[PDB]
Ligand binder design. Structure first.
Ligand SMILES: [Zn+2]
Ligand SMILES: [Zn+2]
Ligand SMILES: [Zn+2]
Ligand SMILES: [Zn+2]
Ligand SMILES: [Zn+2]
Ligand SMILES: [Zn+2]
Ligand SMILES: [Zn+2]
Ligand SMILES: [Zn+2]
Ligand SMILES: [Zn+2]
Ligand SMILES: [Zn+2]
Ligand SMILES: [Zn+2]
Lengths: 62, 62, 62, 62, 62, 62
């Protein structure tokens, strides 16, 4: 049985409602595309400071 | 800038078409709920092997 | 050689002693079941706020 | 609610029986040391390939 | 196409310049050794408190 | 103590020699920029499968 575990890393400062909706809608997405039982779908959100991530070697804070 | 990175761990056995849809729909969910620019949303699917995970100390899903 | 790396995500607010014991006992568990050298077993704990995770699309804070 | 999620990265090559025991014993360790409800404790084992990891810049364990 | 995603867990308290340089130099390392396009290389830094990690069952704080 | 743990997710298809170099060079980068003792720097390479990841909702790199 599928037990999806979703980790979402994104920029800090999201509203509680944005977080709430992200968890629900990401769960919907996983459920409908894979057929996983909804009760087996887990979501964790990790917020990041802009000085802790980047692309092409340049941090978002810079 | 937002740069969401989504990791999805799930049991091996979905088709490439299902995983294509999973990428699209997780991206839709992140874009809708956080306002992140679509071009900055990344999704990685990691496939778990049978017998390599569990809940409640047993090799089953929830 | 096995080099186990363990990541434990759990609800924030654990006592320092609970954390201490978790690291030791999880290490014991990995060592005894896999035969890994104890010196090669690494544990990281990531504490989560209840508004940053959920199951079945519902956050623990809700 | 607690919802521990434990990820264990370790070298490929353990038997399914050893990995079954690993799931059980990591679950026991988490339950004992944190008080988390057993039904909410999840363990995922990710197998590392030979030559795909290292310590001290060399492809060896500690 | 390669889309490298790098996660660096390390002890908290790094200077902003150390972080900046880590992101740039790790990106250089990935680029030169794999041939990945620099624009596809992503780095996330997760800082850890010494009471949240250990090796051989002993936390750095202890 | 520092104990950096670096995870690198990248598309399957590099040679073992390239991955050896990746481990060495990521280690060099971490050592240079943070001052971490080399013996405490760990690198794990996780290979993503084709069609198992994307950016902008499509199965392509940036
Ligand atoms: Zn449903
Ligand atoms: Zn994390
Ligand atoms: Zn797959
Ligand atoms: Zn669960
Ligand atoms: Zn021992
Ligand atoms: Zn993984
Ligand atoms: Zn295995
Ligand atoms: Zn080590
Ligand atoms: Zn370049
Ligand atoms: Zn490989
Ligand atoms: Zn990108």
């Amino acid at each position: 049985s599928m037990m999806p575990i979703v980790n979402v890393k994104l920029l800090e400062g999201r509203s509680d409602e944005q977080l709430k909706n992200l968890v629900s809608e990401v769960t919907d997405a996983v459920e409908k595309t894979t057929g996983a039982n909804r009760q087996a779908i887990h979501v964790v959100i990790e917020e990041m400071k802009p000085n802790h991530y980047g692309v092409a070697g340049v941090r978002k804070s810079d």
